[PDB]
């Protein structure tokens, strides 16, 4: 999914943290592969020095969703860009909205 500008398919978690931290800007975000769950992705956003990371998975039928807390309705999205657009809006259940894309 190279068409996702914010997707960095060759970086590690550590590399992901350094890129975000380098922005010095809360709300900066990227997507990377998980280094713990093969085949899963990680949506990473900077807040007060820490990188809040949401595992993102594709369904057996093609749609996308983010790890969701217990007792909360999970949302699915046809396109990854759609999931990303949703979480750029205020009050969607992540620590701060996705605000500044850190692009390839």
């Amino acid at each position: 999914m190279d068409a996702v500008a914010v997707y960095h398919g060759k970086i590690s978690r550590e590399t992901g943290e350094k890129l975000l931290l380098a922005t010095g800007l809360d709300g900066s975000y990227l997507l990377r592969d998980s280094e713990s769950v093969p085949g899963v992705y990680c949506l990473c956003v900077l807040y007060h020095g820490y990188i809040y990371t949401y595992r993102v998975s594709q369904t057996e039928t093609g749609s996308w969703s983010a790890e969701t807390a217990p007792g909360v309705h999970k949302r699915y999205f046809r396109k990854i860009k759609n999931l990303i657009s949703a979480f750029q809006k205020p009050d969607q259940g992540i620590v701060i909205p996705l605000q500044y894309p850190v692009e390839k």
């Binding site: 943290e17 931290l21 990473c44 990188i51 595992r55 969701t68 969607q92 992540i94």
Partner: peptide, 10 residues
């Protein structure tokens, strides 16, 4: 560790 694995809360 600077990475925190969080979950969508809404």
């Amino acid at each position: 560790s600077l990475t925190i694995y969080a979950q969508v809360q809404k």
